[model samples]
Target: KKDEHKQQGELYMWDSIDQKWTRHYCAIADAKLSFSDDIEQTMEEDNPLGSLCRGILDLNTYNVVKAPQGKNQKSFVFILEPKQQGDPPVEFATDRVEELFEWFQSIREITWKIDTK
Candidate 1:
C-alpha cells in the first residue's frame, strides 16, 4: 500500500472471536489503526485483541456506504459485517456529503494496496 495515514474518533470493531461488536476507540498510529477499550486507551495499544493493521484493513468487513437517509440530507454509512453468519451487518455514520468523502478517502487511503478502483 502507498503512504497514507491519519487518526479517527471511533470505530465499531466486529470481534468475530467474541461474536460481538466491541465499541472501540480508534486512531491511526505507527501505521496501524489501533483500537482500545475506551477513550482512556485510545492512543494506547493496551488492548489484547490488537488493531486493524496497515494493509490488512482493505480485506476487513467494514466498508463505506451511502446510508439510506433523507434525500435532502444524506448520511454516510460505515458497515461492519462480521465473518460469522450469526452476526448481522453493523452500520455506522461518518461525515455528511462532501465531508463523508473525506472520511472515505482517509479510510480508503489507509486501507489501500494500490487500489486503483
Candidate 2:
C-alpha cells in the first residue's frame, strides 16, 4: 500500500531568505516531498492542502545531503539540493538521528527507483 512507505514528521527547516530556522510538518510520498505549517492537515492523505502547503520538492530533480556526525540535534541536519540552478537548497534537522536516517532512507527509496511496479 502507498501508505506503507509514506513518511510524515515534524522537523526544523532552514529558511535561507528569512535567515531563520522554522518548524514544519513534512510528508514524503509519491516521488515528491511536501511541506506544511499545519500538522493535522499534513496527516490527512485526502486533503488538497491547496494553500496550506509551504512548498513541494520533486524528488526526480533533487538531491539529499546528510550532515556530518556531531554532538546534538543540530548535527542531524540534512539538505535537499535541487538540480536546477537559482534554487537554494532546503535544509532540515531532525530531533533524533534515527528520524534523520528514516527520512533519508525513505527519500532514497522513492528517488532511486528505476520503475514503478
Candidate 3:
C-alpha cells in the first residue's frame, strides 16, 4: 500500500531583513505500516515508531546575526517534534547545512516497502 504525502508539520523562518517568511517542506513518513511486524519490532527495540507513524520530520533552521566586532554570526535552532516526548528536536545553524545534509543521508538507510509501478 502507498500513502499520500501529508503535511505532518512545518518549519518557519522569519526573514527580518527581507520582512518575509521562508518555508520549506517538512519530512514525511509512510504510515501504511502503522500496525505491522516492523512497528512491533521497533517498539520492542525502543525505536521511534510513534514519530515515524505520525509523520514527524525534524528539520533545523537558523538565523544570522551580527557579532560584537561587526562580524557575521549564525545561531543554531531546532524546529520540529522530537522522536520521543522527552527527547530534544534536531538542531543546526545555517552554516551546519552540510552536517544536516549528511544526517539526512544516513536516514535513507532505513528500509521501507514502496510499490513499484
Most accurate candidate by lDDT: 2
The list of candidate 3 runs beyond 4 A from truth reads: 1-80, 94-99, 107-117
Each prediction's TM-score against the native?
0.39, 0.69, 0.20
Give me the runs in candidate 1 sitting further than 4 Å from their true place. 1-5, 11-24, 29-32, 40-63, 70-74, 80-90, 95-99, 110-117
- Tens-digit per-residue lDDT, 3-62, candidate 1: 743656665443455554445655655434444563432334454654444122323334
Model 3 residue 5 distance off true place after TM-score fit, in angstroms: 30
- Cα-based lDDT at residue 96, candidate 1: 46
User: Could you tally the backbone clashes for each prediction?
Assistant: 0, 0, 0
Q: Please give the lDDT score at residue 5 for candidate 2.
A: 39
- Give the clashing residue pairs of candidate 1, or none: none
Per-residue alpha-carbon lDDT of candidate 2 for residues 1-117, written as tens digits (9 for 90 to 100): 345635787767765545656668888767777887645423445766547567887888777767676223366676777778778776777667688788777776655443657
Cα lDDT tens digits, model 3, 27-105, are 4344211211222222234544444333333222211122222112344432333333476433222335554443233
Q: After superposition, how far is residue 14 of candidate 2 from its true place, in Å?
A: 0.6
By lDDT rank, best first, the candidates go 2, 1, 3
Shift of residue 54 alpha carbon in model 2, Å: 1.1
C-alpha RMSD values across all candidates: 8.1, 6.7, 15.8
